[PDB]
Paper text:
UvrD is classified as a SF1A helicase and plays important functions in DNA replication, recombinational repair, methyl-directed mismatch repair and nucleotide excision repair. UvrD consists of two RecA-like domains (1A and 2A) that are responsible for nucleotide binding and hydrolysis and two additional domains (1B and 2B) that are involved in dsDNA binding. Here we present crystal structures of full-length and a C-terminally truncated construct of D. radiodurans UvrD (drUvrD) in complex with 3′-tailed dsDNA. Our structures obtained in apo- and AMPPNP bound states provide us with several snapshots of this essential cellular process and reveal a large-scale spiral movement of UvrD around the duplexed DNA.
Crystal form I appeared very rapidly (<1 day) and belonged to space group P212121 with two protein monomers and one DNA duplex per asymmetric unit, while crystal form II appeared after at least one week and belonged to space group P21 with four molecules of protein and two DNA duplexes per asymmetric unit. In the structures of drUvrDFL and drUvrD∆C form I, each protein monomer contains one bound AMPPNP molecule, whereas in drUvrD∆C form II each assembly is composed of a DNA duplex with an AMPPNP-bound UvrD on one end and an apo-UvrD on the other. In drUvrD∆C, loss of one of the AMPPNP molecules leads to the formation of crystal form II in which the apo molecule has rotated 125° around the DNA with respect to the position of drUvrDFL or 105° with respect to crystal form I, resulting in an assembly with one drUvrD on either side of the DNA duplex. In this assembly, the apo-drUvrD∆C molecule has twisted the 3′-ssDNA extension and maintains the ssDNA in a bent orientation with respect to the DNA duplex axis. As a result, the DNA duplex itself shows a reduced helical twist and reduced bending. The loss of the bound nucleotide also results in major structural rearrangements within the protein monomer. Loss of the nucleotide induces a ~15° rotation of domain 2B and an ~8° rotation of domains 1A and 1B relative to domain 2A in the plane formed by the ss- and dsDNA. In the AMPPNP-bound molecule of drUvrD∆C form II, nucleotides 20 to 23 are bound in the binding pocket, indicating that drUvrD has translocated along the ssDNA by one nucleotide compared to form I and as a result both nucleotides 24 and 25 have become untraceable. As in ecUvrD, the apo-drUvrD∆C observed in crystal form II, reveals a fifth nucleotide in the ssDNA binding pocket. In the absence of nucleotide, however, only two of these contacts remain: the GIG sequence in the α17-α18 HLH motif interacts with nt7-10 and Phe633 from the β-hairpin motif stacks against the first base-pair.
Author numbering:
A (entry chain D): 7 to 134, 138 to 529, 533 to 550, 559 to 662
B (entry chain A): 7 to 167, 173 to 450, 461 to 529, 535 to 556, 561 to 661
DNA sequence: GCAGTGCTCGCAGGTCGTTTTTT
DNA sequence: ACGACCTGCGAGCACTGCTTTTT
């Protein structure tokens, strides 16, 4: 583990950091992940720290996964390290200490779908018909800022989201209480409740801080008030906290992420040491230059840059097309050309501000028989068929999971319907009972028709499943739940239609077998992770061109990148245009992220005209193109300078 | 009219009766009806009375009409006559001028089905919720009362009951009937009764058109009617009622055996006229009839002497099953018709409408003409009824009961959920339904269609008015879109035009519907609409006051001739059914045949049956016939 | 432009009670 | 045996209103 052998000099210094706090600024391509793992390896090896004591924190599972494998190769006793998501940590903490704040065994975690359920119910009598999601987001940003239904409606300005302080705040008020009644927490709770647990019960904070003596928090620019608070609490005792971020890459301010957190970090921790990694290995010099010039525009953020390390590669180009249709045609003309130049589909990707944009693009590649992968924004990431099965699992684990019940009741159809269902629910509400136990007593207590049995059968097979969970392995249990539920059969028709949703379900079952390989482990446990998995994180690249939003692009890189619809009111989104400068800066950060993702060549497009939501209008051109004028060549349809 | 030459002395004086209450009382086929007919011809011809000045009230307008031509045969002046049922008149009383009592021009009548739609409606609300969910039970108790003139308050005050439940159900049912501005049958009377007593000034005005008052088939007559009568009369007592106690089969409907008899106590002046001779039946028939009836002990004592020589024997045949019973009647109808008997002169009498289904089949195979009475209204059939709903609701906005049946069939875009949102609009505003609908733009489409129909009601004649609705409703289009089987459905709807044109010859609009609602089973609207030489099928009940040379009585069995209902009830029910049987035999003139099966099917289950207890009564007053007549 | 949802209006399959009469 | 009834389910229509998303 010789840091000077392993790493860059500036890296080695950051990896050499030991106690007290440090800020690590990592621009793109900076080999931050490597650096940070060795530091972990150094801390244990060189400074004789304990793995028990080290906590690494990231935002995504991919990240945490990469973190854990890499560590394993390099660090002995890697098993004993706590690397996970803010959420995954939150789960772990609350599963172990929930009872101190009134969470019973075994409470449930509501995913984003499940929230809506509740929301629709609580809406019934509030001043505010419309849409329920809206409200879901209102809550989510509220819980993210660490806001309470009370101090929400104490908000100076009454219409931050449509509806008055109280009309908004009431929904959140009601949503809270019912949620709690059901014995459950949403995804933000895992952070916000955990904060509250620490704050109330400090003695609990300690028992934890013995497991988190040293702390890495990645992407500290995306961090939010609530995540901020939690981190401070964890680190408050020993101040051994190293947060790696990049201020020019906060692109989730709508998620309520606070760029100020990382800016204020050396103000928050006056003693902290600073380290800056400005070296970009990933990208071309011409790319980086474009990127660096673009970015210096954002006002008064931390003084840093992208040090080139590859020769100034191929030029950056910017074609404009009359047609938003033409640009899609234009894009395919090129992916062909380059696939012919000797360059694989995997090597190339297309980035768009909004998902809508994928269709014209997609349809264009589809005409020149060009493989396409769309990092789905319209369609769930393996989510619908996975979360269903869990609904069975989660209802089998406790029969009072009425949210789980409402969802799997439709799949497959049991011949239970709006009438039966609501009857069973009216009765249940009226006697303080689980909808499912209502099912179980349909025949015993007067629910007319001989549907009763369709209700009694469901309870019967649910409870069959419950016995199984007690007496089976995780993998076998999903084989049981799958075949008995008949999700396979209904999905076999929709499977004959699809067949894939059947496959990653088999893949899920496989991953369940992998769960029991690693040491340690309750069924309840496997499910705790699965609930957070979006996209079934654990098969090699598809060999397609990739399509994704710029937001989606973050932390990924491609030899070839296409950035499309680089126009005013698209990029530099009109919405953000209303926000004034503060908003424009955020957009600029977004544009910046794309550029930094391109390794060898970057093509840019906009249209003369574009259609959105019906009609066709004159497309303006992106002001950020000004910001980088001269650092790119404009072009006709074929690659000609003009 | 020369009474003495045309009537028996006892009859000739009875008909001669000229003022004040009088009562004729006789056994069946005695001329009570016939003498009632001559009475009319007399007062016109002899006692110089305006025919405009008399009414005879019955239990079918055909009883009346065939009754009309009769005075015409006797005295010209059959035009100015007034003859109808209580209802046909008790409706005309109210309807012609209801310019008092508080009602509104354009009201509607609620038939049995109409009734239930409100009883199914206001039923959930009040505590009789469980096995009294059965809806029919309530409309009965709602109807038996309006027959005794009872209100909800005095229904609340009763011995043994669900009591305030019953009365409230009625209380609501009414304030909801009130709402739709429609009137249950009873009302027809009751409101008639009420009105007279409400305004003693208005009633006199009628007693000018009712100078002398005839009542036939007083046998059965409810207390609502009794008071109507008692009232209609009182100005100057000029009432004759005629009837037979042994022929009182309308108990279930509140017609009081005793209601009839106490007429003497009610009226002092009443001159009781008695009749002893039977003109209608062969002696072997009457002997059986007389032999039977004697079993209703503590009934009155009349007697029936034959005027006719004893005849062909009364015969009885038991068959293997209900088919073999229908096929037998078919076979025999064929034979008799062969002897030169005409279909017109034969009839089959059963206890329950259901029994007609099978008999017909036997008749169809052979290709014998038949006409059924009061089984499956042409005016019942979907095709017709819904357009009558268009008609009801066209004129009367408030008819939600109808609104229901018409909005759906012509698929107008209209929401099951829109309904419950609009019925809430009714419930919130306390509004007539259509108005809530009038003011999701199908509401504007229905309103301009509906508004039109009623606005185009007064400019258009009924015959072409119905073709206005039928086309504009699109009810045509729906029938043409799904009309392979539906073609018979528009054929009825074409027939509905023709029957309007039949109506167009006579001077008899909304009026039309009245008739349709009030139609007796034997009334003409119901008959022609639903060859003239045809066999006639009807219920023993309907048989009342008619006669047939040849009569079949099918299904003379326990649980059926007596009826399960009557048996369960014990004696008072038996004597009633028995009296029903006596009514059966008494329609025959020459030939009576009786049948039962050994096994009858109902509800898909073929079940053993046994001969009526009644056959036992007439031990050797009938021969027992194998399928072919022998033994 | 498309999607996510409202609500219609109809196959489809099972329960049930309907027969004691009439206006 | 039959006609009404009631659910259940799912293919249709036209309604409208919206930037971006991780666990
Ligand atoms: N005096 C008579 N002269 C000739 N025919 C008569 C005489 N009285 C009755 N009839 C006939 O015998 C039958 C019985 O007459 P009708 O007046 O219908 O009997 P009813 O006493 O009214 N009994 P019901 O059948 O109970 O109504 C009819 O055909 C009459 O025309
Ligand atoms: Mg689900
Ligand atoms: Mg008579
Ligand atoms: Mg009817």
């Amino acid at each position: 583990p010789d840091l000077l052998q392993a790493l860059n000099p500036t890296q080695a210094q950051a990896a050499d950091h030991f106690t007290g706090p440090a800020l690590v600024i990592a621009g793109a391509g900076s080999g931050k992940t490597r650096t940070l793992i060795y530091r972990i390896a150094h801390l244990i090896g060189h400074y004789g720290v304990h793995p028990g004591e080290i906590l690494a924190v990231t935002f995504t599972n991919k990240a945490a996964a990469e973190m854990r494998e890499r560590a394993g190769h390099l660090v002995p006793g890697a098993g004993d390290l706590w690397m996970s998501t803010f959420h995954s940590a939150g789960v772990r903490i609350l599963r172990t200490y929930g009872e101190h704040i009134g969470l019973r065994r075994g409470f449930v975690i509501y995913d984003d779908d499940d929230q809506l359920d509740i929301i629709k119910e609580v809406m019934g009598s509030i001043p505010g018909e419309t849409q329920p999601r809206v409200i879901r987001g209102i809550i989510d940003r509220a819980k993210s800022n660490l806001w309470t239904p009370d101090d929400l409606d104490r908000s100076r300005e009454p219409f931050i989201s449509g509806l008055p302080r109280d009309a908004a705040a009431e929904a959140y008020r009601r949503y809270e209480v019912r949620k709690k009644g059901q014995n459950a927490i949403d995804f933000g709770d895992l952070i916000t409740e955990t904060v509250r647990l620490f704050k109330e019960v400090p003695g609990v904070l300690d028992k934890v801080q013995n497991k988190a003596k040293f702390i890495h928090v990645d992407e500290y620019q995306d961090t939010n008030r609530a995540q901020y608070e939690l981190t401070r609490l964890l680190a408050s005792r020993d101040r051994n906290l190293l947060v790696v971020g990049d201020p020019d890459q906060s692109i989730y301010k709508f998620r309520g992420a606070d760029i100020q957190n990382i800016l204020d970090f050396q103000k928050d921790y006056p003693d902290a040491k600073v380290y800056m990694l400005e070296h970009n290995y990933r990208s071309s010099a011409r790319v980086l230059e474009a990127a660096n010039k673009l970015i210096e525009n954002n006002t008064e953020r931390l003084d840093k840059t992208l040090k080139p390390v590859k020769e100034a590669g191929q030029p950056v180009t910017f074609h404009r097309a009359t047609d938003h249709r033409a640009e899609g045609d234009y894009v395919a003309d090129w992916l062909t050309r380059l696939h012919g130049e000797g360059r694989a589909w995997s090597e190339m990707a297309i980035l768009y501000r909004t998902n809508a944009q994928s269709r014209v693009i997609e349809e264009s590649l589809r005409r020149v028989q060009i493989p396409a992968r769309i990092v789905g924004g319209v369609g769930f990431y393996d989510r619908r068929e996975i979360r269903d099965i869990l609904a069975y699992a989660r209802l089998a684990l406790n029969p009072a999971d009425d949210v789980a019940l409402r969802r799997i009741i439709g799949r497959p159809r049991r011949g239970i319907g709006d009438t039966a269902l609501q009857k069973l629910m009216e009765w249940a509400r009226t006697h303080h009972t689980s909808v499912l136990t209502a099912c179980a007593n349909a025949a015993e207590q007067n629910i007319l028709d001989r549907g009763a049995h369709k209700a009694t059968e469901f309870a019967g097979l649910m409870e069959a499943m419950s016995e199984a969970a007690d007496n089976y392995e995780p993998a076998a249990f999903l084989r049981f739940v799958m075949e008995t539920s008949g999700y396979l059969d209904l999905l076999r028709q929709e499977g004959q239609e699809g067949q894939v949703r059947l496959e990653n379900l088999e893949e899920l079952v496989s991953a369940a077998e992998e769960w029991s390989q690693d040491e340690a482990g309750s069924i309840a446990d496997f499910l705790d992770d699965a609930a957070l998995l979006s996209s079934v994180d654990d098969g090699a690249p598809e060999d397609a061109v990739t399509l994704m939003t710029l937001h989606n692009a973050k932390g990924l890189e491609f030899p070839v990148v296409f950035i499309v619809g680089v126009e005013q009111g698209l990029l530099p989104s009109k919405g953000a245009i209303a926000e004034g400068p503060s908003g424009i800066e955020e957009e600029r950060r977004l544009f910046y992220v794309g550029i930094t993702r391109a390794m060898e060549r970057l093509l840019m497009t906009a249209a003369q005209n574009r259609m959105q939501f019906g009609k066709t209008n004159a497309a303006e051109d992106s002001a950020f193109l000004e910001d980088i004028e001269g650092l790119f060549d404009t072009v006709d349809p074929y690659g000609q300078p003009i």
